[PDB]
Amino acid sequence: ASIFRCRQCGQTISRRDWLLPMGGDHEHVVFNPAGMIFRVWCFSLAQGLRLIGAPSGEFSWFKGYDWTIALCGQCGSHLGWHYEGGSQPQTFFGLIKDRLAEGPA
């Protein structure tokens, strides 16, 4: 199955095999308080990121979870968020679909 790389630089990030259907669907379309819309795809696992700062519960799109911004560890592109502090699963990643490129493994 296909893998996901950072659109800006090609860093390996995740895999289609690691999609996670949260609340029944791997895709959630959401807005932040600055009104930016995101098509977030949920993955159980990702790599090649760099998580910035400390976790926050504020404005979390997923109930019970705290988030941290996740950048591409290579180019710094904002690729999504890491979620933790929750239940079933405790942790996962929400990645912005249009910031990733999908392709062969």
Q: Which residues are annotated as a binding site for Ca(2+)?
A: 25, 27
Q: Is the peptide bond before 104 cis (omega within 30 degrees of 0)?
A: no
Binding to Zn ion, residues 44-73 (CB under 5 A): 72
- On whether the CB atoms of residues 24 and 42 are closer than 8 A, the answer is no
Contact region with Zn ion (CB under 5 A), list: 8-16, 40-48, 81-89, 90-98: 8-16
* Nearest CB to Zn ion, comparing residues 21 and 78: 78
Task: Please give the biggest Cα pair distance in the chain.
Answer: 37
Q: Residues at the annotated binding site?
A: 6, 9, 25, 27, 72, 75
23: left (phi over 0), alpha (psi -120 to 50) or beta: left
- By the rule CB under 5 A, 11 interacts with Zn ion: yes
* Nearest CB to Zn ion, comparing residues 71 and 89: 71
Q: Which of 4, 5, 6, 94 binds Zn ion (CB under 5 A)?
A: 6
| Count of residues near Zn ion by CB under 5 A | 8
Other residues' Cβ atoms within 10 Å of the Cβ of residue 39: 13
